[PDB]
Amino acid sequence: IVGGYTCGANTVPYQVSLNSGYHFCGGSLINSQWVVSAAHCYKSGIQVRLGEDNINVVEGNEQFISASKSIVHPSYNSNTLNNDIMLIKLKSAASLSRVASISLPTSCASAGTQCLISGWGNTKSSGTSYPDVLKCLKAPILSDSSCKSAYPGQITSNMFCAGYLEGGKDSCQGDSGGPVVCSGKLQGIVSWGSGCAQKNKPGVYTKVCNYVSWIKQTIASN
Amino acid sequence: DFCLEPPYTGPCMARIIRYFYNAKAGLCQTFVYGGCRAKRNNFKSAEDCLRTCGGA
Ligand SMILES: [Ca+2]
């Protein structure tokens, strides 16, 4: 997260860290045994870390649970990045105020909606600086038109842009798979962009409201 | 020669550590890969990197 602020310990209870010997992606807890993240974050040997604030020191509120199954959307396209969503089943159920699940959306959010984006990704647009603690950012959802203007022929109906055209505030490496929460509902998943916090290049997110039925049924039959 | 190409992080926002052959240093080094659209000078281990590109 570039241009954000320190969230404060366990103030984003649904935020998870995907660990493979080190933090490589974020994710959101949607129920005691399931996590949603990005499809490009698929990796073998994933350990999910819940209740984290400082990802470098054991603070006592953590729960490290291995993934038993990782389900990448059947239509995920690694070239176009369309359908960049994945479900991770925990090997055991997490014990749910410092660890809680986030609600799925009943409807899609409109342009202008203010959302909270969180993650342990790079905090520098030009440079490298990974934080110990969780960072937060409030950014508005942008209209489909402007999103398509920023990324010609790359935006599908399953993607939305959020951020500031001026730049300076955005998600970055290390944030992929993390949550974009608006009005208490999970609306997006950090996915891709052109650099971080660049002017006229807002971040691109997976539009969760289009996958709700797939998520509910997939979770139930696995 | 793809072994001579600089490392490519790509457009995705992950922080995945991979290896690339650094022809200047004559060795495989680590870099941050974003998770998608990998070019060929991108390996999961130093051994794979040295086998494919070593000595380029
Ligand atoms: Ca910790």
Whether residues A68 and A120 share a domain: the answer is no
CB atoms within 10 A of CB A116: 18
Instruction: Give the residues across from A72 on adjacent strands.
Output: A86
Q: Which ranges of A133-211 would DSSP assign to H, the alpha helix?
A: 144-150
Domain tally, chain A: 2
For residues B9 and B31, the answer to whether their CB atoms sit within 8 Å is yes
Token pair of A51, please?
């209740």
Whether residues A129 and A193 share a domain: the answer is yes
CB atoms within 10 A of CB A158: 21
Helices and strands in chain A: count of H runs, count of E runs: 2, 13
- What span, in angstroms and rounded, lies between the C-alpha atoms of B44 and B56? 18
For chain B, report the end-to-end CA distance as a whole number of angstroms. Answer: 8
Give the H/E segment covering residue B22: strand B16-22
In CATH, what number is assigned to the domain containing residue A80?
2.40.10.10
- What span, in angstroms and rounded, lies between the C-alpha atoms of A156 and A92? 35
Whether residues A30 and A127 share a domain: the answer is no
Whether residues A88 and A133 share a domain: the answer is no
Ligand 1 center to A175 CA (angstroms): 17
For residues A87 and A214, the answer to whether their CB atoms sit within 8 Å is no
The reply to whether A23 touches chain B by the CB within 8 Å rule is: yes
Whether residues A45 and A119 share a domain: the answer is no
Whether residues A153 and A214 share a domain: the answer is no
In CATH, what number is assigned to the domain containing residue B22?
4.10.410.10
User: Which range of residues forms the domain containing residue B37?
Assistant: 1-56
Instruction: Give the residues across from A135 on adjacent strands.
Output: A6, A119
**Residue A36 backbone dihedrals phi, psi, to 5 degrees:** -110, 140
> Closest Cα partner for A42 from A69, A79, A82, A14?
A69
Cα–chain-centroid distance for residue A169?
Answer: 16
User: Which range of residues forms the domain containing residue A29?
Assistant: 13-101+210-221
CB-nearest to A191 from B13, B16, B37 is: B13
Token pair of A164, please?
């500031």
Inspect the interface and report whether the beta carbons of A121 and B32 lie closer than 8 Å: no
Contacts of A81 (CB under 8 A, 6+ apart): A40, A159, A191, A192, A204, B11, B12, B36
- What span, in angstroms and rounded, lies between the C-alpha atoms of A13 and A163? 23
Amino acid at A25: C
- What span, in angstroms and rounded, lies between the C-alpha atoms of A12 and A34? 17
Token pair of A160, please?
């939305």
Only one residue has tokens 């508005």, namely A140
- What span, in angstroms and rounded, lies between the C-alpha atoms of A48 and A34? 10
Whether residues A85 and A154 share a domain: the answer is no
Inspect the interface and report whether the beta carbons of A22 and B12 lie closer than 8 Å: no
Whether residues A115 and A203 share a domain: the answer is yes
Whether residues A83 and A142 share a domain: the answer is no
For residues A164 and A142, the answer to whether their CB atoms sit within 8 Å is no
Radius of gyration from C-alpha coordinates of chain A: 16
CB atoms within 10 A of CB A33: 18
**Residue B3 backbone dihedrals phi, psi, to 5 degrees:** -75, -15
For residues A105 and A181, the answer to whether their CB atoms sit within 8 Å is no
- What span, in angstroms and rounded, lies between the C-alpha atoms of A33 and A88? 8
CB atoms within 10 A of CB A206: 30
Whether residues A79 and A161 share a domain: the answer is no
Q: Which of A40, A144, A146, A149 is catalytic?
A: A40
CB atoms within 10 A of CB B37: 17
For residues A118 and A7, the answer to whether their CB atoms sit within 8 Å is yes
- What span, in angstroms and rounded, lies between the C-alpha atoms of B45 and B32? 13
Q: Cα separations (Å) of A31 from A20, A34, A95, A118, B21? A: 22, 5, 10, 19, 42
Domain tally, chain B: 1
Phi-psi category of residue B5: left, alpha or beta, with phi > 0 → left and psi -120 to 50 → alpha: beta
- What span, in angstroms and rounded, lies between the C-alpha atoms of B4 and B25? 11
Whether residues A88 and A127 share a domain: the answer is no
Whether residues A87 and A123 share a domain: the answer is no
Method underlying the structure: X-ray
DSSP-derived secondary structure for A111-134: TT-EEEEEESS---SSS----SS-
Please count the CA atoms within 13 angstroms of the CA of A65 that sit on its side-chain side: 22
A2 three-class SS = strand
CB-nearest to B14 from A40, A128, A130 is: A40
